Amino acid sequence: KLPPGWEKAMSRSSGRVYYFNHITNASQWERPSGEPARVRCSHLLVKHSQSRRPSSWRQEKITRTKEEALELINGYIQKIKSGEEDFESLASQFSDCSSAKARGDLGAFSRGQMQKPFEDASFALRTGEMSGPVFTDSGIHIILRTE
Ligand SMILES: CN1CCN(C)C1=O
Numbered sequence: 001k002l003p004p005g006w007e008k009a010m011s012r013s014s015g016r017v018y019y020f021n022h023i024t025n026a027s028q029w030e031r032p033s034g035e036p037a038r039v040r041c042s043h044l045l046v047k048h049s050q051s052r053r054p055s056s057w058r059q060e061k062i063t064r065t066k067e068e069a070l071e072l073i074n075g076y077i078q079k080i081k082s083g084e085e086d087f088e089s090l091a092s093q094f095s096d097c098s099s100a101k102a103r104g105d106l107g108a109f110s111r112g113q114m115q116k117p118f119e120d121a122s123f124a125l126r127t128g129e130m131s132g133p134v135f136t137d138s139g140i141h142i143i144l145r146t147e
């Protein structure tokens, strides 16, 4: 029927159908279009008090709750999708990962090297696509597949 992971849904506020992917947490109005050994990705990470290491270059002690970290992630997605901000600008300014200094770029990788939810989401994205909120033991991610 549809590419790996997609299903049909119905909007509560409008009644119009849309499409949702349960591996990447992406959602969109348009019908999805149409595996390699390696992919290249960038990300933006927001940590919280239950993160495996609750600290980062922005903050020596990270105290925000998990629910608060999800609201921040949701707001960044809104501004990227409306075009008010670029994915690379927000990651340089607000990502709790050391890769912030490289506009979020993590380089290329294979199956076996990253935390499993991040890996499954990275390899189900198409080239140029962005994920929704993805959860690991580091925190909450937005993923952009560049190659
Ligand atoms: C093991 N790593 C490095 C960065 N990332 C998202 C991981 O899961």
Ligand SMILES: [Cl-]
Binding pocket: 126, 127
């Ligand atoms: Cl592709």
